[PDB]
Amino acid sequence: MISLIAALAVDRVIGMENAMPWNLPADLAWFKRNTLDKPVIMGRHTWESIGRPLPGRKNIILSSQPGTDDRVTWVKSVDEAIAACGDVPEIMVIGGGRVYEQFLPKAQKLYLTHIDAEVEGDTHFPDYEPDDWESVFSEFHDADAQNSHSYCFEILERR
Ligand SMILES: Nc1nc(=O)c2nc(CNc3ccc(C(=O)N[C@@H](CCC(=O)O)C(=O)O)cc3)cnc2[nH]1
């Protein structure tokens, strides 16, 4: 089963690590718990953004150029990446944008963190049809002494 996961700001916008205008430890936990002991696929830009294999998960880099680092698995295509994954119950796609769109049509599920914040960004998560997706979980949180902004966790299943 293929899965997508992201953090979005107002208007489907998605941003970089250092760009991360927000500060939500809670979202991170959420993400870790939803990716742990699972494979994660990602673009090179994200590779780069992160700087180190993410521990406890199989890190696969989807990219057109040859790899530049033995700690990870470099893939040249959607198909190649899914194959490298082997038989697992869930594949978590983590971006970037191009990444997202390339797999959405394959996804069966979505993990989204809705963040109450307006920001200028380049990229957007792919416009996904809400009538095709069914909301199976939600949980809203007000900002707090650790969480800089209000947020909502949401999981959707493809009807
Ligand atoms: N919901 C959601 N939130 C995100 O922040 C997110 N980030 C990416 C891409 N960027 C990143 C950047 C850093 C780390 C990182 O260190 N992750 C640690 C959590 C570390 C902590 O608590 O400091 C991990 O082990 O997963 C993960 C993804 C993709 N989907 C996301 N999805």
Domain ranges of the chain: 1-159
Between the CA of 80 and the centroid of ligand 1 the distance, in Å, is 24
Q: Record the resolution, in angstroms.
A: 2.3
Residue 42 Cα distances to 12, 23, 115, 127, angstroms? 19, 22, 22, 19
Task: Give all strands of the β-sheet with 151-158 in edge-to-edge order.
Answer: 73-75, 58-62, 39-42, 91-93, 2-8, 109-115, 151-158, 133-141
Q: Whose CA is nearest to atom 8 of ligand 1?
A: 94
| Residue 151, C-beta contacts closer than 8 angstroms, at least 6 positions apart | 24, 26, 27, 113, 114, 115, 116, 140, 141, 143
- Technique behind this structure? X-ray
| Residue 106, C-beta contacts closer than 8 angstroms, at least 6 positions apart | 2, 78, 82
88: helix, strand or coil = coil
Q: Whose CA is nearest to atom 31 of ligand 1?
A: 6
Mutate which of 18, 23, 28, 148 for ligand 1 pocket (most atoms within 8 A of beta carbon): 28
- Look at the block and give the residue holding tokens 């792919």: 126
Q: Whose CA is nearest to atom 22 of ligand 1?
A: 28
Report the binding-site residues for substrate. 5, 27, 52, 57, 113
Q: Which residues pair with 157 in a beta bridge?
A: 109, 134
99: helix, strand or coil = helix
Pick the CATH number of 1-159 from 1.10.10.10, 3.40.50.1980, 3.40.430.10, 3.40.50.150: 3.40.430.10
- Strands 39-42 and 58-62, how do they pair? parallel
Spatial CA neighbour of 100 closest among 23, 16, 29, 14: 14
